[PDB]
Amino acid sequence: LNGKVIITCAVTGAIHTPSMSPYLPVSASEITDAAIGAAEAGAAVIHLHARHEGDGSPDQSVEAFNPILGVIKQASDAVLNITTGGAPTMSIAERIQPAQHYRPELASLNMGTMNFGLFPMLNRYESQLKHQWERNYLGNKDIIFRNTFGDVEHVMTTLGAGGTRFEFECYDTSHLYNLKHFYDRGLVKGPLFIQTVFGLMGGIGAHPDDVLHMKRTADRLFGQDYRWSVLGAGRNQLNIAAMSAAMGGHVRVGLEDNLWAGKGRLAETNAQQVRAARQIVEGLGLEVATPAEARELLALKGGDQVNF
Amino acid sequence: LNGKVIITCAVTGAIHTPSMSPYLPVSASEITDAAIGAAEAGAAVIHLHARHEGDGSPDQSVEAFNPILGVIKQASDAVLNITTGGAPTMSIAERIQPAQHYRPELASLNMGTMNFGLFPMLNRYESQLKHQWERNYLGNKDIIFRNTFGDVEHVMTTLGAGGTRFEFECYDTSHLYNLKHFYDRGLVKGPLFIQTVFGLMGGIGAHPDDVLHMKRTADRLFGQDYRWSVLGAGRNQLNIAAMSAAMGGHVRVGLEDNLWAGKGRLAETNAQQVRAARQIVEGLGLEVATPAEARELLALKGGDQVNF
Amino acid sequence: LNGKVIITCAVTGAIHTPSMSPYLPVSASEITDAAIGAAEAGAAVIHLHARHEGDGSPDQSVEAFNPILGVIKQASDAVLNITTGGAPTMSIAERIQPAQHYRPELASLNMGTMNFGLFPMLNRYESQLKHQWERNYLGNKDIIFRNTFGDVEHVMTTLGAGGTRFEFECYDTSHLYNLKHFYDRGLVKGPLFIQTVFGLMGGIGAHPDDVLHMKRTADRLFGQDYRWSVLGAGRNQLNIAAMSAAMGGHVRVGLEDNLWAGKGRLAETNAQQVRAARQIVEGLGLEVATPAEARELLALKGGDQVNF
Amino acid sequence: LNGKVIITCAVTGAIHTPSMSPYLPVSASEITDAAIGAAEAGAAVIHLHARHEGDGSPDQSVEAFNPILGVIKQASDAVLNITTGGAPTMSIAERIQPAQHYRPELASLNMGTMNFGLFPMLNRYESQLKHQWERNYLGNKDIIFRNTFGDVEHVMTTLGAGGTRFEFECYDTSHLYNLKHFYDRGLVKGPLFIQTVFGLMGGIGAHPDDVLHMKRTADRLFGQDYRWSVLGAGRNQLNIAAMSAAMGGHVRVGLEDNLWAGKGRLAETNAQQVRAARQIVEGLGLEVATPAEARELLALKGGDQVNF
Ligand code: PRO
Ligand code: PRO
Ligand code: PRO
Ligand code: PRO
Ligand SMILES: [Zn+2]
Ligand SMILES: [Zn+2]
Ligand SMILES: [Zn+2]
Ligand SMILES: [Zn+2]
């Protein structure tokens, strides 16, 4: 398995909004088409959210994933990874209900409580926002992603009992330290899939020294018992992916994380970012991991051992 | 002013509790005695909280500082720095009322929302906790220090209008990035007093690479328009102070931040930690800054230009 | 010039020897064909050495470049960069005679005296060595590349007078500090073309922390007044090229530096390595620099201002 | 041994010259008095050179150490460490003759060939130079310290057979990689005493990032099997000593390395610099190591197992 790079594709998320790009997937069929195309392009892991079809706003309910998960699984053996994020006012118990019911191989896990903002972008996007929910959100200077020590323990115990393992999303150094606290307690066992997230407002930035700091910290705290992946937000996406691939890590792309392709051009598909990351991986002389290889690298339970 | 090291002394805080050490100052007279002794030992800046005298629990009200601030100022020309922290349930408007009324030269400003915990220490301290509030607090796995982008802007505008400048407490890289957002908007002007805080559960750790990462980040984002200070929590206090002093930075000590002296011995006074930091500073061939020197280095309004 | 990446191709050098790979160019026509193929693949700068045609040993004489330089210039607008290296017993005056006579736009300049060794490969390669000079060289534990402060000054003054600018080869941190000494004296003017060389025995290694250390050091010492390129020796070539490209730097490839392609195979051409670098550059959404773009970025005198 | 800091004192060396400071020890009795005073102040290891008494020039002959070693041993239990440096034209066999004959517990070992220079100080110091040898040396732009792979191997095998262990002087990253080559071959066994040297012209600089780079590199290459000491040349001496002590490392001081005390004054004794380091060590709450503690930490043969 040496020299195999796992590409995760995060297809729509909850941070970007439909007025920001006509290519952001909104309907269940757009999301499944995006996931299937990304998997066919080489993404072994698909990170999934759902949205309301009427206005594109985030929908974290159990049933919102019903027309998503089985459709993708029928078409692709990719590893499906269900978010545990949600609105700042939603309880951790409600946020984990989709992963608790579907028992996926992976669920995402944000490792700390943090501010988040997109309000600096209001000058560029306000005139094109079509829905009031987007105006309310983009203008909100009081957003927190809440993931207390007690919340994270609850997710680890409750979802871990169903065989789900985590994409541990770590947005700054303290998230790696928080993860070390739970790893030393035995609440999660290795190999840990650690997704270090760069460039978001409220998180660490995307400078090369930020990337190496996160890598050095994770190496020191976890040794060989983790698998490193990077998420470079926005136009950092491919620069940070190339650093990770060149350093022995794995790569996350997707329209959840970056709407752009080049100088002012929007990305039209998730598959197009997978293809770019694959060009970098293969240019290095490495190979993209298949879903079966990713399941071995991440010690996952199998695409059949799920409730969909 | 080159080669002058500002020692800040944080005398009691709100993180440690009285059952943890009989030397933690609780009454207003204990706090003023601690501040005056620390200033006489060489601390040019005193970071202040108040407590209820009956049970030692934190007291963030305006009047709790009345028997503190004028008493210290009568005895010492040190710069008095009032906290803006408070219970996780207290609004930012209520948290800033003491600094808003007293118009101090400095107030503290936490730069992001973060988890915090002391619950891992429950096994060592539970049997000695005398007050139920300490049991409730030490056992709480859901503590957040809330400092949203909107909260921080409110503090900057409201307290800045009274001439107060900030001790910007930055507990991880993202806090430096958050501060850069407000600095670029002009909401705070340099020189920025940046207190990088190491070793707390919920914050960055205290490894030497953490220290250098925070320093490099601040240098890149702020250039020469800041003054660096370090706070090493707990038994990291003097190791991190010595790194900063040897690198051109300033130093924070105090029982708010570290209860210990050596191998299992509690520190008996704040002045004793000031004396240790002063031994390191002078051993380097440097000198401890006086309050007048600190006011020049930090561009402060003067110890007379305050409402006490 | 935003987003334009200069690819240097070093076609043969003096460190590898013919018995290590049948694809290492030896004759003048193999060296010119290699250079022209590399430039056609996208290399804007060609770093050149010559060899004796009979046994492949290094030939640093003026006339050894006569059947090389004008031939490449007639076929390609690439920038031609002449080595100033030489056998350890050759004086700096003799080493510089080729660049002194030909007055190229670029010449290489090693910034410090250092050990170098290949002897650990002797066990594997001894049986296949066809020439005694290769046995004497690979077995030599006493190799030094001599470049004293006086030597480097002589190169800077003597070749600078002919309008030649330098590829400053820096094989460790001290080489960047040596360069800073001469830059502060005004003996070289920016923009400095700094080639940081990783992975040779006797130089810095090729770990990612070594790459970021050389970048951070150069950024601190030279600011905006340099252009960074990387040389990852051996199988580090593409990993380190990808880091550089992803960080705003330029890339050096070539059979002088790395005999290998992917997965343990030898590289058949220099062009194949240029193509691999170009796949990484274009995968990042960047563009390979043309010779005219490299001349502007490096402030070079022009391909029509040379003595060939 | 937790918390015990080894102070090495290098009393005279060969880099500074008498006309730079009247306090640099020259005669055998000035060198022994300096060593005994430094050991009494707290230095557990004394790094020794000899000089010609008539003009102060370096004297690397066996017999130049005869009025030095036994005199110090009779007065102090400090570990005596004999240089293996020498004029650039002296063979490695001649350079090692003193340690070869005397079979000390420690000998110094420079791990690579490098430039060295003092010529930038010539303008300021020329008028005060009293001896022609000092003028010839300070003006020399062609100084190399020669330590090839073959040279270092010869030192390791020849002096190792007498039970001498090494102070491995590493003046840049490549020296730690050179040491790793010999350690992996088994030519030296741990624990390795690694002295990372900062700030010399021709070596790595003395910026805090240089210090952390050498520490991180040594930690990665050698793990727990080394003991780290720092040498900050010149006025960097105490800043870098403080970083090391605060990070779990050891400290080297002495007039060989730094002629200065504080605030631009020359240091009158080696003991004065030991006292300053000890003030930093004790201010940190650490303790200076005794000779017996240094022998255990460095796995030395004992002061009664030497040939003097
Ligand atoms: O999308 C997710 O899964 C995470 C939750 C916080 C922000 N994004
Ligand atoms: O004590 C203060 O001022 C800060 C507030 C959060 C934790 N400590
Ligand atoms: O090939 C060159 O130009 C350099 C000289 C020293 C080693 N390689
Ligand atoms: O003094 C010594 O032992 C080393 C040898 C090279 C420079 N200094
Ligand atoms: Zn997500
Ligand atoms: Zn406080
Ligand atoms: Zn070359
Ligand atoms: Zn020496």
What is the element string of chain A, with H for helices and E for strands?
EEHEHEHHEEHHEHEHEHEHEHEH
Number of domains of chain A: 1
Helical amount of chain A? 25-40%
Biggest interchain interface, per-side counts: A-B, 37 and 37 residues
Shape of chain A: globular
The percent range for strand residues of chain A is 15-25%
Count of helical stretches of chain A: 12
Distance between the amino and carboxyl termini of chain A: 28 Å
> Briefly, what CATH class of chain A?
Alpha Beta
Main sheet: strands, sense, barrel of chain A: 8 strands, parallel, barrel
Assembly classification: homotetramer
Structural class of chain A: alpha/beta
Bound molecule kinds, no repeats: proline, zinc ion
Q: How many extended strands of chain A?
A: 12
For the record, the CATH architecture of chain A stands as Alpha-Beta Barrel
CATH topology of chain A: TIM Barrel
CATH H-tier superfamily of chain A: Aldolase class I
| Arrangement of strands in the largest sheet of chain A | 2-3-4-5-8-9-10-11
**Radius of gyration of chain A (Å):** 18 Å
Could you characterize what this model shows?
4 copies of one chain form a homotetramer. In chain A, the strands form 3 sheets. The first copy, chain A, has an 8-stranded parallel β-barrel with strand order 2-3-4-5-8-9-10-11, surrounded by 8 helices. The first copy, chain A, has a two-stranded parallel ribbon with strand order 1-12. In chain A, strand 10, helix 10 and strand 11 form a beta-alpha-beta unit. In chain A, helix 1 packs parallel to helix 11. Chain A has 12 helices and 12 strands. Chain A has one domain: TIM Barrel (Alpha-Beta Barrel), CATH 3.20.20. Chain A is α/β, with parallel strands linked by helices and 308 residues long. The structure holds proline (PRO) (4 copies) and zinc ion (4 copies). The PDB classes it as lyase. Keywords: aldolase, bkace, lyase. The assembly is tetrameric.
